[PDB]
């Protein structure tokens, strides 16, 4: 749990979030969101910094919770490098698919989070010796959570492309990772 990449990520999300409370959501979005304009396509940070933005205490705490719990496990059991790679690929791919689904105005760490969910479960399943796993007790919620976004649970506009893309990506990485060693 006490991993550097785990905490460096939690710290950044909290910095950025606080910045969002001072400046306002939209003003942070114009700089951190996925490129809305192909002119902006070379502002490379935007492909990753959308993961840093949250729009409610609930949004961020719920995300950081999962991230601490799942990110922690991968960092501890598998190193900081494996975590970063998972975070970068899924922030890049789930941003990418989410932009296709509903455009460039989104953010949150849930893309990376479903990738961690997908990864920890598929990896604990195929490579038990890797010392990580996900309670079926969680994978349930996982699936409630994803399908509840499909129905926009009580007006909650969820990034549905991000969740599934992230989920898929984690499963691919864990499956590939569960062939070596």
């Amino acid at each position: 749990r006490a991993g550097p990449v785990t905490w460096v990520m939690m710290i950044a999300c909290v910095v950025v979030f606080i910045a969002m409370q001072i400046l306002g959501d939209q003003e942070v979005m114009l700089w951190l969101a996925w490129p809305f304009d192909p002119t902006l396509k070379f502002e490379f940070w935007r492909y990753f910094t959308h993961a840093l933005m949250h729009f409610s205490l609930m949004h961020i705490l719920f995300n950081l919770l999962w991230w601490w719990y799942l990110g922690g496990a991968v960092e501890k059991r598998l190193g900081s490098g494996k975590l970063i790679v998972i975070t970068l690929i899924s922030a890049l791919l789930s941003g990418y698919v989410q932009q296709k689904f509903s455009g460039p105005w989104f953010g949150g760490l849930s893309g990376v989070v479903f990738a961690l969910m997908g990864y920890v479960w598929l990896r604990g399943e195929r490579d038990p010796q890797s010392g990580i796993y996900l309670q079926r007790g969680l994978i349930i919620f996982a699936l409630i959570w994803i399908v509840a976004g499909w129905f926009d649970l009580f007006g909650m506009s969820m990034a549905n492309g991000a969740h599934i893309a992230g989920l898929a990506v984690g499963l691919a990485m864990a499956f590939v990772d569960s062939l070596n060693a």
Partner: peptide, 5 residues
């Protein structure tokens, strides 16, 4: 609106 990942 915005969508929450």
């Amino acid at each position: 609106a915005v969508r929450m990942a």
